[PDB]
Structures are given as C-alpha cells and as structure tokens.
C-alpha cells in the first residue's frame, strides 16, 4: 500500500529541493531524525512519510505533542524583493483532524500545523541555504493550522501570523513586554472541506505575505517588519495537541519563484 514519494513525478521537483525532518515518537535520541539532506529522496519510505499507492497522496503522519514530519525547502529567501515572490502550493486533505485532537489536555492544545514560513536568521549573516544561523528567532512568520475550536468556529483553518520581528523565546528577557504579549494575528482562513481537498498557495516577496485558499486570497499582509529575516518553507504535519496522531494527505505540493503573486 505504501511507496517512496521520490517515485512519483508530481512530487519530484519539490523533493529535489527539500530535506525531511521527522520525529521518532518512540525513539530515545531526543533530536528528530533527518533524511535526504542532499535533496535525494530515493528509497525513503517511513511510517511518517510515504505515498499511498491507491490515491497517490503524499502522507505525512505523526503521533505526539510537538512532534513533526515535514519537508524543509532548501531556499532561504529574502521577502522584500520587488517582482520576486516565493510560492508554496499544496492541495491537502487533513485526515479526521478532530479525532487527532480528541484526547488532548486542554482547549488551547487543539491545533495541527500543515504549512509554515519560518526564519533561518538575518539577511546580514553569511550562512548557506538549507540551514539556520545568526539572527534566528524562535517563531515562524506564519503557520497555517487546523484548529478544533476557536472563537465559536469549529474545524477551521487559521493563519497564525507573527506580527513583529521580536525574539520572544523563554531566554529572550522579552516575554513580559507589549510586543511579545501582542505578537500574533490569528486569522480564520476557511472551514476544512466537507469533501475533497483544500488548495493553499502561499506567496512571500515584495514585502507581502499572500495566502490563498481554493484560489481566493484570504491573507494579504505587509511584512516589511520581517524583511531582515531570511525565510523558508516547511510542509507536513507538526502537532500542537497531546495524546494522539495527526495525518495529512498532500495530493500536490510545489515550490516555485514567481514574478508576481496571485491576488483574487
Ligand atoms: O502556545 C503558545 O504559548 C504560543 O504558541 C505560539 O506558537 C508557537 C508554536 O506552538 C510552536 O511552538 C511554534 O512553531 O513556535 C510558535 C511560536 O510562534 O513561537 C503562538 O501560537 C502563540 O500565539 C501562542 O500563545
């Protein structure tokens, strides 16, 4: 039933420019495993990363709080260039995500992240693609998440946007500040599909973050405050809930560099 994603033409392009980071839910190493660090995914099939032969879905699957199975796209890109927009396209079906979160500990821990724009560190700093370095702050620019319930909305996708470039980590000395208390916009994108897939396109460039869902722009947000941070894409599952396992089927996942975003 399970095959190597590298065998499937529709995923080959994105995999050539990615590595896989995958937690080991019962491993005792305490740091995630990493694979295809050279962008070569031949032979890679795991419980947490495979193609389902029948549907040809790329499956990311992961038990346990804060664990993840995700590809990390190589390019550390600048978000402030005119006419250069970095684009992550995905067509996904989350698999019974309400079941995944059903045994969680508290209402806030009821989320699953599918797509991210994270920072690698400063545009000022000389470190290569594919890794992180000086200037890194421990917050992604945006996560597209499923949330079971928020603000009366049940089973919607949300964009969790970091709305400043401040380090608000536990060792920052900043957690009490206004910037840190008010650091995020959490904005509702669309309910999860009743049937079929949900199509996402993220464009980052020209000092903008654009997020489309089913070809309709849901987020169109100036990100000039982030433009000192080299940024990069991740896609898969990453768990903000306890005591279960998440699963997402990606029927398409693409990465490209465009002269302009699609705004509609
Ligand atoms: O749950 C929280 O205390 C805050 O989480 C923040 O998102 C975290 C996220 O859960 C992962 O740890 C992540 O990738 O790092 C994130 C970050 O932005 O630092 C935000 O959701 C924040 O609103 C929460 O209060």
Residue numbers in the entry: 39 to 302
From the paper:
In heterotrophic bacteria that use alginates as crucial nutrients, alginate lyases depolymerize alginate into alginate oligosaccharides (AOSs) and then into monomers for assimilation into the central metabolism. The overall structures of these PL7 alginate lyases are similar, showing a β-jelly roll fold composed of two antiparallel β-sheets with a deep cleft. The noteworthy structural differences among the solved PL7 structures are the loops around the deep cleft, which are variable in length and sequence and involved in alginate substrate binding with the deep cleft. Structural study on several PL7 alginate lyases reveals that two loops around the substrate binding cleft determine product distribution.
To explore the structural elements that affect product distribution and hence Dp specificity, alginate lyases that would be suitable for comparison analysis were first screened. AlyV is a PL7 alginate lyase identified in this study that preferentially degrades polyM when presented with alginate, polyG and polyM as substrates (the detailed enzymatic properties of AlyV are presented in Supplementary Fig. 1a). AlyV mainly degrades polyM into trisaccharides, with a trisaccharide content of approximately 82.9%. To obtain information about the substrate binding cleft of AlyV, the oligomeric substrate M8 (MMMMMMMM) was cocrystallized with inactive AlyV mutants. Unfortunately, no sugar unit was observed in the structures of the AlyVQ139A-, AlyVH141N- and AlyVY261F-M8 complexes, and only two sugar units were observed in the structure of the AlyVR91A-M8 complex, which was attributed to the minor residual catalytic activity of the AlyV mutants. The crystal structure of the AlyVR91A-M8 complex was solved at 1.90 Å, showing the typical β-jelly roll fold with two sugar units bound at subsites -1 and -2. -2 subsite: The side chain of Lys209 formed two hydrogen bonds with the hydroxyl groups at the C-2 and C-3 positions. -1 subsite: The side chain of Tyr207 formed two hydrogen bonds with the C-5 carboxyl group, and the side chain of His162 formed one hydrogen bond with the C-5 carboxyl group. For AlyV, the corresponding two peptides linking the four β-strands were composed of residues Pro117 to Ala134 and residues Val183 to Leu210; thus, the structures of the two peptides of AlyV showed long loop insertions with small helices. The length of loop1 from AlyV was longer than that from PyAly. More interestingly, Lys131 from AlyV loop1 formed hydrophobic contacts with the sugar unit at subsite -2, whereas PyAly loop1 was too short to form any interactions with the sugar unit at this subsite.
